């Protein structure tokens, strides 16, 4: 009783609106930064080929072909591995307790942008240290900018041990969007009509805007330079790759079943190749040119401080938050361009946290649908996920909550995590399901036989990937470091470890309690377990379809 997308765009403009936003504009830029620059395009280039297309076109085949959710996609395809699945709900959860946070602080961006002044742009505040000097007579100091994002918005704390007090503007903040995203979750309320073309054209024309602005800046040339020029000797540690890796698997949004969930409201009969490939271009060029306008922002910062372009701004979550800005009161009138710029970030992040949350909330519903979907019963359960996640966000508006964040961003829904996922769901499907049973699949489905570019990324080149950089991140090990100067203690590692257990324990946990409801010998068990029920039979009778 899968419901269909209606209109062929429909579903288009859906996973567009969720598969970009502060994955192309926040955290690729900041992962781009805090790795070198131009080092960091060689491994993601690689994870974007080999990887991370094939990867997203299989979650929307399956999703397609199977005509289910997260979960009883892979039961249908290998019930053995079904953990795989409940893996993915566990990452989007962790995700959603953190990706929602940083639209709090555009939120609190948009409250200070509504005043005369932009409250980044002198030292003369409350809240700024002695060492503030302005950026035109800086000619040790620091600039306004970056002092009102550390002191002002986030205030921050010496170090994670020290969690401070709750900041109350944030916490309104958070609890305001996470009130938006219950009300459209409930109600339903989505872009629909000409709102689209406001949801779709206003964000890839602010981007332009800046794309104009921070190409015209003096000293962009240096800025372009250090992002697109690769240092080689960094890649000779596993930081860049995995952080690549994990970068196109957060971009594409894939591993967390939203992706399959997304394609399962698909026909059957629907060229859903073409559509995916078109798409991951868009993503992978708005993410490029996006680093452009950021780097010639950054690199005008580095000119007009005098310090070098690796230390203009934060090596971190905050970097979006310190050049946008900056970039914003070059142009004229200013108050009107941070309103506008923090409406299409703000608007982005929405966008996102509805189809994750969306998504996750359809994944439980449909895993026990017994009292659970009788109409106000799933009104309860989304205002109890809604809660749940905001009082766990809660612990990353205090004032040493920052560092608690990337813990978030770099363990919980990223890291080796999704490299147990994305290398699992090739390995059941290259090597149990079949390579060439799924590519009948798919030329039954879309009309013509693919090509082996989808077959070898299954077979071979995904998984050696993510397990090359597991194995060499795990062998060359260096602990996270917030901002390249605090060094987190020995629990805070173990609570990020914790987090990416969560999900990559789920997987081998599964197949265990499987083994154990089984009755009878071990290889009987491993071979009922091991063998496909039905994927297709949804679909069998609806279009026509050949079956399985
Ligand atoms: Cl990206
Ligand atoms: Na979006």
């Known amino acids: ?48 080929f080999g990887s991370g297309l094939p990867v997203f076109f299989l979650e929307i085949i399956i999703g397609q072909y199977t005509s289910e959710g997260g979960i009883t996609c892979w039961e249908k395809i290998c019930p053995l591995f079904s953990g795989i699945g409940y ?60 002092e009102f994002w550390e002191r002002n918005v986030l205030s921050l704390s010496p170090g994670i041990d020290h969690p401070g007090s709750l900041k109350w503007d944030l916490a309104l903040c958070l609890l305001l969007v996470w009130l938006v995203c219950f009300f459209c979750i409930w109600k339903g309320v ?16 602010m981007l332009l805007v800046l794309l104009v602005r921070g190409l015209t800046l003096p000293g962009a040339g240096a800025g372009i330079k250090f992002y697109l020029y690769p240092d080689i000797t960094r890649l000779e540690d596993p930081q860049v790759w995995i952080d690549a890796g994990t970068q196109i698997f957060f971009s594409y949004a894939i591993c967390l079943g939203a992706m399959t969930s997304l394609g399962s409201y698909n ?51 905050g970097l979006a938050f310190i050049a946008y800005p900056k970039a914003v009161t070059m142009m004229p009138l200013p108050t009107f361009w941070s309103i506008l710029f923090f409406i299409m970030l703000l608007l ?22 017994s009292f659970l979907r009788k109409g106000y019963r799933r009104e309860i359960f989304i205002a109890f996920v809604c809660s749940i996640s905001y009082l766990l966000g809660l612990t990353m508006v205090t004032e040493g909550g920052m560092y608690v964040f990337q813990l978030f961003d770099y363990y919980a829904a990223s890291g080796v995590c999704l490299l147990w996922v994305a290398f699992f769901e090739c390995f059941v499907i290259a090597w149990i399901y079949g390579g060439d049973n799924l590519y009948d699949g798919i030329e039954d489905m879309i009309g013509y036989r693919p090509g082996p ?18 194995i060499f991140s795990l062998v060359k090990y260096v602990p996270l470091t917030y901002n390249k100067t605090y060094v987190y203690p020995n629990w805070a590692i173990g609570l990020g470890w914790s987090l990416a257990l969560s999900s990559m324990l ?23 377990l091991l063998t496909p029920r039905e994927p297709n039979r949804w679909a069998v009778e609806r279009e026509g379809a050949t079956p399985y």
């Not at 680093?291 to 979550?317: C, H, K, N, R, Y």
């Not at 359809?362 to 026990?368: A, E, I, Q």
């Not at 989808?454 to 397990?467: D, E, G, N, Q, R």
Request: charged share 15%.
């Open 1 to 48: 009783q899968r419901e269909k997308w209606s209109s062929k765009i429909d579903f288009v403009l859906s996973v567009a609106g969720g598969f970009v936003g502060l994955g192309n504009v926040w955290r690729f830029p900041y992962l781009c930064y805090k790795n070198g620059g131009g080092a960091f395009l060689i491994p993601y280039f690689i994870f974007l």
């Open 87 to 146: 893996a993915s709900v566990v990452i989007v959860s962790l995700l959603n307790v953190y990706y929602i946070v940083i639209l709090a602080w555009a939120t609190y961006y948009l409250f200070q942008s509504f005043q005369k002044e932009l409250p980044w742009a002198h030292c003369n505040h409350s809240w700024n240290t002695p060492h503030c000097m302005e950026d035109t007579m800086r000619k040790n100091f620091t600039s306004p900018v970056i």
């Open 190 to 205: 989505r872009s629909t009509g000409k709102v689209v073309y406001f949801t779709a054209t206003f964000p890839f024309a």
């Open 267 to 317: 026909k059957y009969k629907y060229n859903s190749y073409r559509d995916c490939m078109l798409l991951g271009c868009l993503n992978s060029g708005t993410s490029f040119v996006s680093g452009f306008a950021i780097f010639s922002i950054l690199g005008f910062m580095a000119q007009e401080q005098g310090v070098d372009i690796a230390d203009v701004a934060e090596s971190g979550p």
């Open 348 to 369: 982005l992040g929405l966008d996102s946290q509805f189809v994750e949350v969306e998504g996750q909330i359809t994944s439980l519903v449909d895993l026990y649908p």
């Open 453 to 470: 570019w989808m077959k070898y990324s299954w077979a071979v080149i995904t998984p050696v990937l993510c397990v090359g950089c597991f």
């Open 506 to 528: 789920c997987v081998p946990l599964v197949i265990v309690i499987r083994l154990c409801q089984t009755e009878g010998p071990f290889l009987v068990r491993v071979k009922y």
